[PDB]
Write a protein that binds this ligand. Structure first.
Ligand code: 3M6
Ligand SMILES: OC[C@H]1O[C@H](O[C@H]2[C@H](O)[C@@H](O)[C@@H](O)O[C@@H]2CO)[C@H](O)[C@@H](O)[C@@H]1O
Ligand code: MG
Length: 513
């Protein structure tokens, strides 16, 4: 492969303690004579799947657990199998965070949650509510200070407020149940936008700007995670870490992340990586080395957390964590975060109204599951000649899109039968490994669009054609992964177009009779 044998390359995000991680690398190198190299590439969570998909990249990838399901689904991660004894050294719920389809796909490192960080000298008694921050800002502005600055370019930081009065991603209690554009999410975002309209915050504020303003004592509060504490320590600001403000009497609910370490599927150094992570990093001295660089939060290792738990900053971190929720690791978490990122930025800048912004994010977030429901049902009923008698769920969009697809797809399949026959024969889709090869082909072709619903119908119709063939040669098991592959290709390459058409509602209206 392209990844070098007998070395370790490790990627971790630039806001984490990568210099501390390098020391742990240095110790490994001392013992074994094996080179360890730590990098913190920009846009890491985007860069890794790009390079790993070609069998390249780092041996070890660090990120919060939410992205790892997508990585694993794309075949980019090796299954990890720690022995029972190592497993028992970490909290079971941190292992739960890195389980995907019944398999462990990463080592959990530390539990991260946002807290309210405040300047004790400016604000001895920080607000318990979001609602009182406008008035507090006015009071502080008279002194040449502002109340609150935090990163508005990443939805992670705004999510706690969105979730406060009822917003949610995928319902936890149902991936078909998405609460990005309900009244609670709209109330939360609207409050944020009003703060901006009323000059209490600035839409342009990002991570660097907010951090600088807090650490220079210009703003009384910021919202951030444990990794940020080291820089505040250096600035000598007298800070406290506390519970996030409530909104409409309800706690802010941060999405909780577990910093995790995955092993590249393409790495020839999986045994080396295992050794490094289990017996160097995930020890008291290993985690201390990283934690002393940038604080990890509440670590997964039971022994070392027993000490860190005494830190009131950690207690505050876990208080906020318990009021929030552990992130899902389903493959469309990335699409969810992109949708909401755009919604927050657009609402904050005035490019969209809050309502229209969150509507788009709802559609974006639901896009994979909605598309899969339609495409899977269509391919299956086409292959077997009979519909699925199971209930749709939410909602009328699926039923109407499927009705439309059946009606339009009938003519498309009749007219394209000869073409489909030739393409099926040209390719050789005979099993599930052939389905993967088709995806790579489709990704290349479908970026040359030029998108309309007719082309999408032709693609799905070819899918149905192939599905029929797979049933005929007794490979009915291949139909669902075919549907997933086409769905993945479609929603990935035509995401923006699909959201612009209002998703499958646009499909139904376009072909309305
Ligand atoms: C018909 C030829 C066959 N072919 C030739 C060049 C060739 O080189 O063989 C393709 O490369 C080709 C390859 C894979 C998919 C498809 N397309 S297809 O699935 O609809 C199809 C499959 C089999 C057929 F017989 C006819 C259409 C391919 O089409 C192309 C035409 N083409 C450029 C296109 O269909 N583009 C497109 C479709 C959907 C979407 C989207 F994303 F909006 F859905 C975007 C772009
Ligand atoms: O803003 C969306 C973003 O949120 C989370 O990323 C966090 C990460 O978990 C933290 O470790 C820290 O680095 O801040 C990040 C936000 O800038 C999700 O983990 C990530 O997938 C998502 O894109
Ligand atoms: Mg819209």
């Amino acid at each position: 492969g392209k990844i070098e044998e007998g070395k370790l390359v490790i990627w971790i995000n630039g806001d984490k303690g990568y210099n501390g991680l390098a020391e742990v690398g240095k110790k490994f190198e001392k013992d074994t004579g094996i080179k360890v190299t730590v990098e913190h590439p920009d846009k890491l969570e985007e860069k890794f799947p790009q390079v790993a998909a070609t069998g390249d990249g780092p041996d070890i990838i660090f990120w919060a657990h939410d992205r790892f399901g997508g990585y694993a689904q794309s075949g980019l991660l090796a299954e990890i199998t720690p022995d029972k004894a190592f497993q028992d050294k970490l909290y079971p719920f941190t292992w739960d965070a890195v389980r995907y389809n019944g398999k462990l796909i990463a080592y959990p490192i530390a539990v991260e949650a946002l807290s309210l960080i405040y300047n004790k000298d400016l604000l001895p008694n920080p607000p318990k509510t979001w609602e009182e921050i406008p008035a507090l800002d006015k009071e502080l502005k008279a002194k040449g200070k502002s109340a609150l600055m935090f990163n508005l370019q990443e939805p992670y930081f705004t999510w706690p407020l969105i979730a406060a009065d009822g917003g949610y991603a995928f319902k936890y209690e149902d991936i078909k149940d998405v609460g990005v554009d309900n009244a609670g999410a709209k109330a939360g975002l609207t409050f944020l936008v009003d703060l901006i309209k009323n000059k209490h915050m600035n839409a342009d504020t990002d991570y660097s700007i907010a951090e600088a303003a807090f650490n220079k004592g210009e703003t009384a509060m910021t919202i951030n995670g444990p990794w940020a504490w080291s820089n505040i320590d250096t600035s000598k600001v007298n800070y406290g870490v506390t519970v996030l403000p409530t909104f409409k009497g309800q706690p802010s609910k941060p999405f909780v992340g577990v910093l995790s370490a995955g092993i590249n599927a393409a790495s020839p150094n999986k045994e080396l990586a295992k050794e490094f992570l289990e017996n160097y990093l995930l020890t008291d001295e290993g985690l201390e080395a990283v934690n002393k660089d940038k604080p990890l939060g509440a670590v997964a290792l039971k022994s070392y957390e027993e000490e860190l738990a005494k830190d009131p900053r950690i207690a505050a971190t876990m208080e906020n964590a318990q009021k929030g929720e552990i992130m899902p690791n389903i493959p469309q978490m990335s699409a969810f975060w992109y949708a909401v990122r755009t919604a927050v930025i657009n609402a904050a800048s005035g490019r969209q109204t809050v309502d229209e912004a969150l509507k788009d994010a709802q559609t974006g977030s639901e896009l994979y599951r909605q598309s899969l429901e339609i495409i899977s049902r269509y391919l299956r009923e086409q292959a077997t000649g009979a519909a699925d008698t199971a209930p749709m769920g939410a909602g009328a969009t699926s039923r109407k899109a499927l009705e439309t697809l059946r009606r339009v797809g009938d003519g498309v399949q009749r007219n394209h039968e000869t073409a489909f026959q030739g393409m099926l024969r040209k390719l050789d889709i005979k099993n599930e490994d052939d389905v993967k090869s088709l995806s790579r082909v489709m990704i290349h072709v479908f970026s040359d669009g030029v998108t309309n619903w007719g082309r999408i119908v032709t693609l799905i119709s070819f899918g149905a054609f192939v599905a029929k063939h797979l049933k005929t040669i007794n490979q009915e098991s291949c139909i669902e992964p075919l549907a997933e592959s086409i769905t993945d290709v479609l929603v990935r390459t035509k995401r923006d177009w699909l959201v612009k058409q209002r998703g499958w509602d646009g499909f139904v209206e376009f072909f309305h009779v």
